[PDB]
């Protein structure tokens, strides 16, 4: 009933994307809440937040996150000029999504050490169309499904290692899945 | 001893420096060598084989105490194509793969290694000044003793399209770069 796309719900921006593989139900709830239920999904990512995001937003989230297989829960966003995709990963399922990415260093924020990484995406889908761009990762060592993310600590850590922010695009708390099943119910503020 | 190559107590050795001063390379009994350095320039030296092989299992043991920029590695070259390579087992204050292009990961001898390549442009080499690629495997679990199955690295590199030519020397080496330290390493 909610199809892949973007828009606003109950005051919050939301984005939902899938590869058309079937097996994902994304729902928007009251306020900053969204749920995802999935079963033998393909690749998807969806959630609530802001458009545009900012370089110093403190993002609060709370709820339940129950992946069965490949999945992660993150602050997810994009920047323009240069085109950048980024993830501050708060929890993941059966696969560490930083695997294969180049480690850049570490940062401490909001009660955990994070490992930071970058990888190059070549001719991949993006907010401006097929493109080659860098994808930044900050992966929390102490997994959780509630908390507060001071995005500035991660942007500062990435910038130390090559990141430049031109103009911010969207910035959401998102659940990603990749050929897996699960449920999640997350509220953003 | 002075910068050069040779054999000592059954082992090939190579010692190179940039002329800056501040480093002593010493050959010891059997497969042992030591390095002591203090405000050095750039150097690399150690013991092993000439030529090395693409399936050698290399054993090293001892003490490695860098104070600054340094690494401990299986170090060697191939010819045709000219390739310089490092399987880095430990390092000091700087990750020598910094800025190199990551090609993948390989698990070997008790650790995940990150695999990289970079290009050296008009740089010193075993055949003179040249431009050539440099392959890296960098151990995540740092150690100063252990066993290196070189085939696991060479095969992983090949899978990422990193061809090796005819093998030249292959040693366990201590490198330093504008730093101080001591090391005592025995190869077998």
UniProtKB/Swiss-Prot annotation, chain A:
Give glycosylation sites per the record: 37, 60
Keyword Glycoprotein carried by entry: yes
What cellular component GO annotations does this protein have? extracellular region
Q: What is its main location?
A: secreted
Instruction: Cite the annotated pathway.
Output: Glycan degradation; xylan degradation
Residues binding substrate, per UniProt: 72, 76, 87, 121, 125, 135, 170
User: Keyword Signal: yes or no?
Assistant: yes
**Domain annotation GH11: ranges:** 1-188
Q: Which cysteines are joined by disulfide bonds?
A: none
Please report what switches on or represses expression of this protein: Induced by D-xylose, dependent on the cellulase and xylanase regulator xyr1. Repressed by glucose through negative regulation by the crabon catabolite repressor cre1.
UniProt KW keywords: Carbohydrate metabolism, Glycoprotein, Glycosidase, Hydrolase, Polysaccharide degradation, Pyrrolidone carboxylic acid, Secreted, Signal, Xylan degradation
| Catalytic activity entry | Endohydrolysis of (1->4)-beta-D-xylosidic linkages in xylans
The active-site annotation reads 85, 176
Instruction: Show the GO MF annotations.
Output: endo-1,4-beta-xylanase activity
Q: What does the similarity note say?
A: Belongs to the glycosyl hydrolase 11 (cellulase G) family.
**What is this protein's function per UniProt?**
Glycoside hydrolase involved in the hydrolysis of xylan, a major plant cell wall hemicellulose made up of 1,4-beta-linked D-xylopyranose residues. Catalyzes the endohydrolysis of the main-chain 1,4-beta-glycosidic bonds connecting the xylose subunits yielding various xylooligosaccharides and xylose. The catalysis proceeds by a double-displacement reaction mechanism with a putative covalent glycosyl-enzyme intermediate, with retention of the anomeric configuration. Produces xylobiose and xylose as the main degradation products.
- The name on file for this protein is Endo-1,4-beta-xylanase 2
- What is the species listed in this Swiss-Prot or TrEMBL entry? Hypocrea jecorina (strain ATCC 56765 / BCRC 32924 / NRRL 11460 / Rut C-30) (Trichoderma reesei)
User: What part of the full protein is here?
Assistant: 35 to 223 of 223
């Amino acid at each position: 009933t909610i199809q892949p796309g973007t828009g606003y719900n109950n005051g919050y921006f939301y984005s939902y994307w899938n590869d058309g593989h079937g097996g994902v139900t994304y729902t928007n709830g009251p306020g900053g809440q969204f749920s995802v239920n999935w079963s033998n999904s393909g690749n998807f990512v969806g959630g609530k937040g802001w458009q545009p995001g900012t370089k110093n937003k403190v993002i609060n989230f709370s709820g339940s996150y129950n992946p069965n297989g490949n999945s992660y829960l993150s602050v997810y966003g994009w920047s323009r000029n240069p085109l950048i995709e980024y993830y501050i990963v708060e929890n993941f399922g059966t696969y560490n999504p930083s695997t294969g990415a180049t480690k850049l260093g570490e940062v401490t924020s909001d009660g955990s050490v994070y490992d930071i990484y970058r990888t190059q995406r070549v001719n991949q889908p993006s907010i401006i169309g097929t493109a080659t761009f860098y994808q930044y990762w900050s992966v929390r060592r102490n997994h959780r499904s509630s908390g507060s993310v001071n995005t500035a600590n991660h942007f500062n850590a990435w910038a130390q290692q090559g990141l430049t922010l031109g103009t911010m695009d969207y910035q959401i708390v998102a659940v990603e899945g990749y050929f897996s099943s699960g449920s999640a119910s997350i509220t953003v503020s």
